[PDB]
């Protein structure tokens, strides 16, 4: 029912940039608050950004300030990640995930797509 | 003893830029939440931007995503507001604010500064 599908991972060379998206389907995108999250290799889940249902507040993990931008289509339910300046620390698994708006709690998750910074 | 003064307002042609400045003093101010408040000329007040105390994330009034951009400098003590693409629309009297954190709510004040959009 519920549908997220990432793409735009894959490999940079350290400065370069890229841009992640994460289509949804199944559900009133415009609703809920959606989140990226990454894993570094043999490391645990960790926040990256999140962005309200609107549109119109967002967080920003203090490791990507001034590099990293997310932002939403509520019209063709995406959720995107704008990634500049990017450097070998930000080699991950990349998740969106969606949140409930009771708890904001996330109740479900894209398939992850893999993002190596290598010269 | 807490203080803020806020400075940067005034005249701008329609489409032009300007930067509000909200110099803070007396408090410890990465702990508090900030937030830019306006008065259009015989308005009710109307929350304009808001940004956390480690500046991670940040609030728009929908009426100006896109186009201003609040951020603030934990050294300086200072609290800013970029405001880009103005229009008539946008004159008023802006006031920056403070948040208690036990509540969010506003517990002190700017001065206030009038932007006037017109040719």
């Known amino acids: 029912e519920v549908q997220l599908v990432e793409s735009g991972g894959g490999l940079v060379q350290p400065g370069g940039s890229l841009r992640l998206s994460c289509?949804?389907?199944?559900?009133?995108?415009?609703?809920?608050?959606?989140?990226?999250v990454r894993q570094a290799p043999g490391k645990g889940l960790e926040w990256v950004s999140a962005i309200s249902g609107s549109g119109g507040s967002t967080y920003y993990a203090d490791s990507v300030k001034g590099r990293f931008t997310i932002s939403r289509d509520n019209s063709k339910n995406l959720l995107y990640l704008q990634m500049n300046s990017l450097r070998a620390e930000d080699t991950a698994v990349?998740?969106?995930?969606?949140?409930?708006?009771?708890?904001?709690?996330?109740?479900?998750?894209?398939?992850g797509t893999l993002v190596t910074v290598s010269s | 003893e807490v203080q803020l003064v806020e400075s940067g307002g005034g005249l701008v042609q329609p489409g032009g830029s300007l930067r509000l400045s909200c110099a803070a003093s007396?408090?410890?101010?990465?702990?508090?939440?900030m937030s830019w408040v306006r008065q259009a000329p015989g308005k009710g007040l109307e929350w304009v931007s808001a940004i956390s105390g480690s500046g991670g994330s940040t609030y728009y009034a929908d009426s100006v995503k896109g186009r201003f951009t609040i951020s603030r400098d934990n050294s300086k003590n200072l609290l800013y507001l970029q405001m880009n693409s103005l229009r008539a629309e946008d004159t008023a009297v802006y006031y920056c604010?403070?948040?208690?954190?036990?509540?969010?709510?506003?517990?002190?004040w700017g001065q206030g500064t009038l932007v006037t959009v017109s040719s």
């Open positions: 007396g408090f410890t101010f990465s702990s508090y939440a």
């Open positions: 604010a403070r948040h208690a954190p036990s509540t969010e709510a506003p517990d002190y």
